[PDB]
């Protein structure tokens, strides 16, 4: 009856090897999608970055009430949503992080379009969107000589730092470049 | 094991920036903005610990609410003020420099290591500016 | 008996290696085109 | 039986890779602070 | 494989994620995490 | 045998950090912060 016993155990070890086979394949499938995701976001973190073209602001009396920035995609950048981005404003007085808003604000920022389709998303390389920040609202209208340290942080994590330096003299200037 | 070990490597915190409030002439608050890593999952800031190697002390800060020798998390962008769910969420980690040890003077250096629940350590060497004159808020 | 067990697990390991091989290569393919551009 | 041995060695390789991944990231973090300073 | 998104739950939005395990008759499971692109501006068809 | 052998491999300790006190000019305290490894059970630190 030793032929009976081997048959039963043979069935069991087939199942056990199938159980272990599932574990390696299923865990590899888990790590396949996890690793595939990791490469794409990590590349997006390094490549999808905002580049500031030029900075200027409207000035009233002698203290720049509004601060405006012109942004664009960096080299090899996918769609860049300016709505899921946060500019951190480190000014002479206040030092907070601004968030996206619509229709002009207080401690928020607005993005009006200059060239392109969307007015909040940079889709192509020739799109220019104007980041709008109210200086007198976030803190105070910067006098001649104030030095704000702006840093635009994209959703994925790419950070662009711009030191907005107000000219030391604001005389006879309807609107000066920061 | 496969799920936890991948969690140990993947679910990691990246510190976007670090700034500090200034009273009189000393950094009294240490504020840190945090975000997920590439491929991170939901990161809970309540099950995280921060190691504060200060100039005068060395303790491991734990989570609290509304500090002293603990740390609080006020939200910046997103819904949850203690959990980072999406890649566009920013939460501000709050630390009281004049409560975990002594008020950070101009030039003090503190090492902060934010350890997630799964064990992903992120180290940020905070350096108070050498000169603090005429600076209402500094960038650590 | 033990011969049956090692055969099935052998099939498992090559597929897992095939899965792992695809992950690195396809990720390199994404990085190649992104890097090239 | 062969499956039993594979599962145990599978855990070790996952754990060992986690150890190796930890060294790379933590050393990069130390060098990042050194380079930034 | 044709799967109507608007009927199973709802037409996905930019940034969504679905975990799909296509299991055969014999129990072989294949897991795919479909990830809608974070931005759907000016793209007739994407690649999850 | 299966359970203890798995515990030998899976139940492990990970040292998160290693700080220490300083007296005069000598380290009089060695402190270790420890945590479970991936997929570990309860770890009594008295039988270690
Ligand atoms: C930043 O962009 C703002 C976008 O609205 C500009 O706002 C306009 O400024 C004009 C003037 O220069 O003061 C006003 O006539 C418009 O009504 C106002 O919207 C702002 O000038 C610029 O710095
Ligand atoms: C770090 O975060 C703190 C969170 O409470 C900020 O605290 C506020 O600071 C304000 C001011 O800048 O001093 C006070 O008006 C608030 O009452 C206080 O809670 C802190 O400013 C920041 O650096
Ligand atoms: C300008 O020079 C001052 C000379 O006294 C410095 O003052 C000292 O700074 C120390 C520290 O570096 O913050 C404090 O511990 C001393 O109490 C303080 O007098 C000052 O730091 C420097 O910016
Ligand atoms: C650019 O940022 C926009 C910020 O509002 C995104 O807008 C939201 O998109 C959601 C979805 O992803 O389609 C909608 O459910 C929301 O109602 C809409 O405001 C936009 O998707 C993004 O591309
Ligand atoms: C390791 O942990 C020890 C736990 O007791 C710490 O011990 C304290 O150290 C203090 C000082 O830093 O020397 C003493 O004032 C306490 O009495 C002593 O218990 C130790 O500092 C730490 O390195």
Residue numbers in the entry:
A (entry chain E): 13 to 116, 120 to 193
B (entry chain F): 50 to 115, 120 to 193
C (entry chain D), D (entry chain G): 13 to 49
E (entry chain N): 146 to 193
F (entry chain P): 50 to 97
Q: How does the study describe this entry?
A:
The archaellum (or the archaeal flagellum) is a specialized organelle that enables cell motility in archaea, serving as the functional equivalent of its bacterial counterpart. Like archaellins in other species, the Hbt. salinarum archaellin is tadpole-shaped, consisting of a 45 residue-long N-terminal α-helix and a C-terminal globular domain organized into an eight-stranded anti-parallel β-sandwich.
Specifically, cells deleted of agl27 lack the fourth N-linked tetrasaccharide sugar (a sulfated glucuronic acid), while cells deleted of agl26 also lack the third sugar (a sulfated iduronic acid). As with the map of wild-type archaellum filaments, we focused our model building of filaments from each mutant strain on the central regions of the maps, which had the best quality, yielding models of 25 subunits for archaellum filaments from both the Δagl27 and Δagl26 strains. Such alignment revealed the three models as matching almost perfectly, with very low root mean square deviation (RMSD) values of 0.62–0.78 Å. The same density was further reduced in the map of the Δagl26 strain archaellum filament, now accommodating only one sugar. The density nearby N93 fit two–three sugars in the map from the parent strain, yet only two sugars in the Δagl27 strain map. In the map from the Δagl26 strain, the density was further reduced and accommodated only one sugar. However, Δagl27 strain cells exhibited swimming in both single and ever-changing directions, while cells from the Δagl26 strain tended to swim in a restricted area and exhibit jerky movements. After differentially diluting aliquots of spent growth medium from the parent, Δagl27, and Δagl26 strains to account for differences in the degree of archaellum filament release in each case, cryo-EM micrographs revealed that whereas wild-type archaellum filaments were well-separated and usually straight, archaellum filaments from the Δagl27 and Δagl26 strains tended to bundle and curve.
